[PDB]
Design a protein around this ligand. Sequence first.
Ligand code: HEM
Ligand SMILES: N=NC(=O)c1ccncc1
Ligand SMILES: N=NC(=O)c1ccncc1
Length: 249
Amino acid sequence: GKSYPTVSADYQKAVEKAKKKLRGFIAEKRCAPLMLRLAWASAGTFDKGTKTGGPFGTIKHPAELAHSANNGLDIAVRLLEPLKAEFPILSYADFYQLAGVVAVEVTGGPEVPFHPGREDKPEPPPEGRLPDATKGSDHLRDVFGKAMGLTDQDIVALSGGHTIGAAHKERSGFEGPWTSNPLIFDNSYFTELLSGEKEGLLQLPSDKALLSDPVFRPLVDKYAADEDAFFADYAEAHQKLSELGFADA
Ligand code: HEM
Ligand SMILES: N=NC(=O)c1ccncc1
Ligand SMILES: N=NC(=O)c1ccncc1
């Protein structure tokens, strides 16, 4: 359903150069997870019915950073500002999504296709669209399905993003990494989810909800057994997420 906009040769040169610079920066700074979170929080506010929110640069706005779900993302925005300044031609919208794509790549994840052309929109969406970590399958479908317009498969695959990073008690209140290798992008999230609670490792109620849902569970099983399958489905889902409301959604 996508019709991507034309951008100038200079714009595409900048995308390519920014991609390289983001790789070096994100790797050096060890901030891939935070950058993936930033891209996800930018995109996850999309409401299909109204065509509001989504990956349009609004996360840099103090008002959106102030959303409780976005605690700590001001760090991400600040970290990227010097780099972004080297690429004045790029939208913040594109830049943040590019950072998310690079975050997955540099941690060993699939190469998520990237298309430029998102415009920076003036108004952040209303607070409260990002999912609540204490809720379950019904809530996930409301947020990802009814609002964003993503599939059940996309929900499980994208939850796999927690294969990198950690929660922080000063941000969400939850604490610690989901995996033994929080800077490595692999299918370990699903492996850990299946094996039960292991000390030192996090499972949110929202993660656990995948285990009991009739549709989500076989996908968890699939991804734990087949990392290639996870990578394919993850790449598809991340692309869709990064393009919500963009070039038709
Ligand atoms: C399925 C619904 C989701 C819920 C309920 C959820 C909830 C959370 C919470 C509570 C945190 C911890 C924030 C903190 O304390 O630092 C977190 C972190 C994170 N989330 Fe999710 N999230 C969801 C989906 C996603 C998606 C779709 C992605 C990307 C594909 C993602 C990527 C991340 C990453 C990489 C971190 C770690 C950030 C860091 O290490 O600083 N999450 N999430
Ligand atoms: N969570 N904070 C970070 O990712 C970070 C912040 C500043 N410098 C390096 C990394
Ligand atoms: N309180 N909610 C959160 O911290 C959060 C929710 C969804 N994704 C990342 C972070």
